[PDB]
Design a protein around this ligand. Structure first.
Ligand SMILES: O=P(O)(O)C(O)(Cn1ccnc1)P(=O)(O)O
Ligand SMILES: O=P(O)(O)C(O)(Cn1ccnc1)P(=O)(O)O
Ligand SMILES: O=P(O)(O)C(O)(Cn1ccnc1)P(=O)(O)O
Ligand SMILES: O=P(O)(O)C(O)(Cn1ccnc1)P(=O)(O)O
Ligand SMILES: O=P(O)(O)C(O)(Cn1ccnc1)P(=O)(O)O
Ligand SMILES: O=P(O)(O)C(O)(Cn1ccnc1)P(=O)(O)O
Ligand SMILES: [Mg+2]
Ligand SMILES: [Mg+2]
Ligand SMILES: [Mg+2]
Ligand SMILES: [Mg+2]
Ligand SMILES: [Mg+2]
Ligand SMILES: [Mg+2]
Ligand SMILES: [Mg+2]
Ligand SMILES: [Mg+2]
Ligand SMILES: [Mg+2]
Ligand SMILES: [Mg+2]
Ligand SMILES: [Mg+2]
Ligand SMILES: [Mg+2]
Ligand SMILES: [Mg+2]
Ligand SMILES: [Mg+2]
Ligand SMILES: [Mg+2]
Ligand SMILES: [Mg+2]
Ligand SMILES: [Mg+2]
Ligand SMILES: [Mg+2]
Lengths: 286, 284, 276, 285, 249, 285
């Protein structure tokens, strides 16, 4: 009578069912080019990433109050908030249990570190959003390093524990995770489900640039406070962003991060497949 | 790194709340057999209490409560996202704090015990929100997961550091059942009948449901999630009418009896028996 | 099928459980010493009247949007509106089936007449209540004669089909069925004075509106406020629309003892029931 | 007695707005066998039209629909109490009108068949509101009672006055399931958008998805919400198509239409009815 | 730290991002104040009007209150009213203040009648309509040209209607007046020519597009042609009237 | 021209409501020094009452209050758009009544004082709706602008017509803080219920709690909620009373009253005011 496993884990399965690009899985596969972890241990780590990542996504969609993910209704929108919260937390501790494999003294300590950081960054994003105090660009980046840096750290760090590779590539991880989120944040605004970021009231990187670039106007802060689903107000806001030059700013900064991206990978070896991933991901702005 | 102050605000708010935390008093009341080293004892109490309060932060979100120990729920002030993320944060603060015990098996126990907790919680939520009332055996068996987790972490982690070898998991079972059933009964028989508004199948409502299969009112009242005082009062009168409270009391006096017997099998306890006596005064 | 009835009749059984004054069945017991209907036919008649009546209250509870019925939550508050609507309609036709006993060619005819009369009365009351046009005292009395007179007429008339008694009592049923409604509506002694919250035109409310052509607004509000209801009680109290209806109950009821003569059994019910 | 006008205002309104009125074509197409006298036939058609329209007035309250045939629901303009009482009134007016056929068996048939209607309704409402999905067999039985009731009243009341001795209960059954399953499919495959999902009612396709994939309690949950959200409804249709429920509802529909086609030959055939079933069968082409 | 001024006036400036400055004979040197003071008074009146009219958009841009929130835009707008009076304390003229107050009271009277008819569900007549419009749009015109006239010895009460152009342009962001529930001149004329349904559709305050098309169908818009070229008191102004009148052609 | 009645209907409504004459009392007690001519004084009092009540019409909209002087807000019955126009109308009716004062400085002082009122109002609204708690000093300055404006119009306008030339700005300020803090504390402490919390505005008692214990963002969050829930309000007031914010507010109130007396006596004294301020301070005994 262990159908309770299937029922308890149902919101999670639903989310996986929706196509998820699993770019991070492509990454891990292309980061074994440096790591070359035994397949048996690599499969276990990859399981922990997909589990932890999608669990964090389940929780995020509640806390971010989004309506859609990968084009399909969010898990709490169908299964109800309590079920998907508990479901996602369950997947967290299934991940820890799965990490008790590998038999490595360092896996659990690394695990707690990485999840702690993910939760700190995630908590900061919501704190700024809900307490209506915008961060500086540095604060935004530094938190993003924790927010997207968390899972990246679990993946690549867990691979480092079982590799005869001893170097220190966390610089590549920082630069990379900043490329991912800022690609996403720019991608959200520069295009139903239109400008969902504005409805969250979240401080995207572009809104942060417009907010600090022109302290003479308060609007964007106010547009964010409203949390409007109204199409016209959001269209105006992207108009404002463009007039203050923020999408341009994000392009410049994005090409910045990509330029640095190629540098410390060049210094970290060849890595052709990963570079190909990077180009493909940068294709949006051109 | 003052940022923790911000992240831990909902958790801190809940801890400010006066709660006897009698689970601590059951760790130190279970300290009569275990005689755990103090240095390890205080750190264990920290991790068990931490995990407990995180669970409560989540329960009030999932259970959609309005009040806890007389004070507004954390999400009611700080918002749902803030309290969710803070509580999940405190989970891994607990995982981190357990590593100080330096026991190779401490992490294993922490994991299994949390998985049991999440199974119990999920099961309760599944039944209530999916409108399938359980059998009394499914209720007891589940409660052992929902309430058994924290208890098992306490005594179970203490067990690694105790020269005592005997098996208290029987005593724990009886304890968790006596605790949860105590709260369910206390919740319906004393804001007022909050469990009915949650729509959850407490023990008494379950007994009424299966005892008289002819009717389906109880299920229908529960499905509503009603705040109406008149309907709620009707449900308690019907509940008393079928004798669901007499049954709940009786099973409680049953558990208390098995309790006393159980401790006596393991040596005998002056303090804990006094504790359970105090709690059993509730249905005096 | 099996157990299909248990699910469908659950609201109905729920209403039947609730302690009931069962004044219709006693008021029909009274008409036995006149009719002396055979036990075999009488039991079926009492069953059918209780059935149709209890359904009528279920629909009334929806239409009036009452919050309490016999001190216990209304059936739709527990089982939900669709469920109790369909169940109640069900017992309506179960009543028709039950009248297929008695083996009387005319029984179904009387049944049909009395039920359509009921809805005519109920529908008129609902129309005035929801469209804010107060009726004349005559329109009210005639309507109540239809509304409660419907059920009375099925009981006593169907009883008349099986009785060796050939006098007429329709004037009695007139006075009595009007006396019941004016007694109940007249009641204003929590759920206190819900009739005003319904927005219904009570007899006292009708007397108050017509006595001073210068109450309709408080009724239109349909307010649950205790203060609005209490103030409304003041405008009634100074309108004196109370002892006029109470008087009219002493007139109507007083008229009944004389119209009965005859029943002592009905007489005791009339005096006792009139104590308010 | 102009008060009947006010009492019958909701019922008159429903009769006003367009409506398939196809059931009248069913009765006509069954008189090709029954060859009922006009004097009795017109009265039976009046009784079926009345009772049907009343049942729809109540059905909207029970189903919480917003619209009928493109027009506001009766209770949305006249209010719940007014329409409830009006429809019940026309119910018993139907009883009075059937008493004019002067057949001793008509009332017994009326009571029986109306009981059938209310049992089916009660079952549909029960499963929907108490969150218990029914089996495909339970559903089919319910449809035979709910949609079978009135159709059986029409054809059976016609049967009281016909020298025809053939049995038609089998084709009645096949037809009523053709109606309910056709309407359910047409409701979900498309009017409004998936109005059945907003009711939360267990239609034929949704139950197929429920039992076909005992893994996912998604469908139960989307109905449970009674969501008006376009995105949830649209996703649910996506699921229903990927599970197979739609090809399956079609299959049972083409089977049913075929079985319809055989039972008419079993009764010698009916040109108009064959045309009716073909025309209605164009829906799932 | 006098940034509280920027904080106070932001809704106003926001509207300024977004113009008709009719020129007038015998202009005085110091008239910049008339042009500026009228600009302020107009934009403030517009901020409040967008609150009162419940508009969603202005000049293709969100309304101020949709961004800054009703209270902020209200207080800002009143603030700029009194900045207009304060700047009017310039010119050092004893009669300037009196002319200012009088004309502003006229503006508020006209507006108040408009909102009252709309919110009280009573249709206005073409007579009462023209009279009110003279106050609503005429008000600001008076501070402008009268204050300018106090410095020209060229001692004109013409009061040409603009609002009728606005009314037609709204109904010929779709049918925004119909969604507002305001009585445009065409709906008033249509209601009075053939006495019901117009009053009923307007009462709805519907955002529904289909109802709007139905209302657009109903034949009084030809009456709304009107047309007036009654200037010729005695160059640029004629060009203004010509350019604006192209709407009906 | 009966239309004026309709234009002033909201204004007339608020004036109809029974009201405290405390500001009129304040002015009548400042005439002991001012000794304004009756004829000019009466017009001054009319204009002060007008502007005050109009400002109240706007404040109830901006604070989104539900009740004023125990009776529903005017916009709740007559509607927002109507009440704004009424109040703005009353502004310039007040100015126009000041033009009868026939003094070159009357209008200049008037504009100055109205601008200050709108400066304070704006600050309150900005902090509330942008969620920026102010410092105690920023609050006091703001109170001087918002509550100080009308008082300043009063005694300043009378000072234009009084041979009294002694500096009364300090006593005015002490009065302004005394009133506003008296009102805020009175709003949160005793006797619909904690309405300020539902507004989310930073009253003095709430600000002391916010800055006194920066370790917790509760009060900022409760204010952000704008909650009508009675339980949260009761918790929050308990929180203040535990953090000691009430006691702080009382102390600043009694200090203010003391400085008041000093500043009356040091101005030649007064009998009418000394009595008024004592009566007001009995409230926080
Ligand atoms: O922007 P978010 O952080 O919410 C997101 O990137 C999700 N997420 C969650 C944690 N890290 C990233 P998404 O925009 O996909 O909803
Ligand atoms: O009944 P719950 O599980 O919600 C409860 O017992 C909390 N809880 C949750 C897990 N263990 C205990 P509480 O009655 O305290 O609301
Ligand atoms: O006042 P009502 O008509 O509703 C009433 O008399 C019920 N009723 C309904 C129809 N006939 C009688 P009751 O007081 O029982 O609620
Ligand atoms: O879905 P229902 O069965 O209620 C329906 O088919 C009506 N109905 C009522 C009885 N039988 C059928 P409709 O879709 O028209 O609302
Ligand atoms: O409709 P209104 O008259 O209010 C308007 O013309 C503005 N207005 C306000 C006063 N006078 C003119 P607009 O249509 O631009 O919103
Ligand atoms: O709190 P406010 O500042 O709005 C107030 O004091 C009104 N007010 C506004 C300006 N001056 C005083 P009230 O509490 O009476 O609503
Ligand atoms: Mg996020
Ligand atoms: Mg997200
Ligand atoms: Mg994103
Ligand atoms: Mg729980
Ligand atoms: Mg709980
Ligand atoms: Mg409990
Ligand atoms: Mg009634
Ligand atoms: Mg009733
Ligand atoms: Mg009554
Ligand atoms: Mg339906
Ligand atoms: Mg239905
Ligand atoms: Mg259908
Ligand atoms: Mg306008
Ligand atoms: Mg306007
Ligand atoms: Mg216009
Ligand atoms: Mg206020
Ligand atoms: Mg204020
Ligand atoms: Mg105040």
């Amino acid at each position: 009578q262990e159908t309770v496993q299937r029922i308890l884990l149902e919101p999670y399965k639903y989310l996986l069912q929706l196509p998820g690009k699993q770019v991070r899985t492509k990454l891990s596969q292309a980061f074994n080019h440096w790591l070359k972890v035994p397949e048996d241990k690599l499969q276990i780590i990859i399981e922990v990433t997909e589990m932890l990542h999608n669990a964090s996504l389940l929780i995020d969609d509640i806390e971010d109050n989004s309506k859609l993910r990968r084009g399909f209704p969010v898990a709490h929108s169908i299964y109800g908030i309590p079920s998907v919260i508990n479901s996602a937390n369950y997947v967290y501790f299934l991940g820890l249990e799965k990490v008790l494999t590998l038999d490595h003294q360092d896996a659990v300590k690394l695990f707690t570190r990485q999840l702690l950081e993910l939760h700190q960054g995630q908590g900061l994003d919501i704190y700024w959003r809900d307490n209506y105090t915008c961060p500086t660009e540095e604060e935004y980046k530094a938190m993003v390093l924790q927010k997207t840096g968390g899972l990246f750290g679990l993946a690549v760090g867990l691979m480092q524990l079982f590799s005869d590779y001893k170097e220190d590539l966390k610089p590549l991880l920082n630069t990379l995770g900043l490329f991912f989120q800022i690609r996403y944040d720019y991608a959200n605004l520069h295009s139903k489900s239109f400008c969902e970021d504005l409805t969250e009231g979240k401080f995207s990187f572009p809104t942060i640039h417009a907010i600090w670039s022109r302290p003479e106007s308060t609007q964007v802060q106010n547009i964010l406070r409203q949390r409007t689903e109204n199409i016209d107000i959001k269209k105006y806001c992207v108009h404002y962003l463009e007039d203050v030059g923020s999408f341009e700013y994000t392009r410049n900064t994005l090409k910045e991060l990509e330029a640095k991206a190629y540098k410390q990978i060049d210094a970290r070896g060849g890595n052709p497949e990963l570079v190909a991933l990077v180009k493909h991901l940068s294709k949006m702005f051109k």
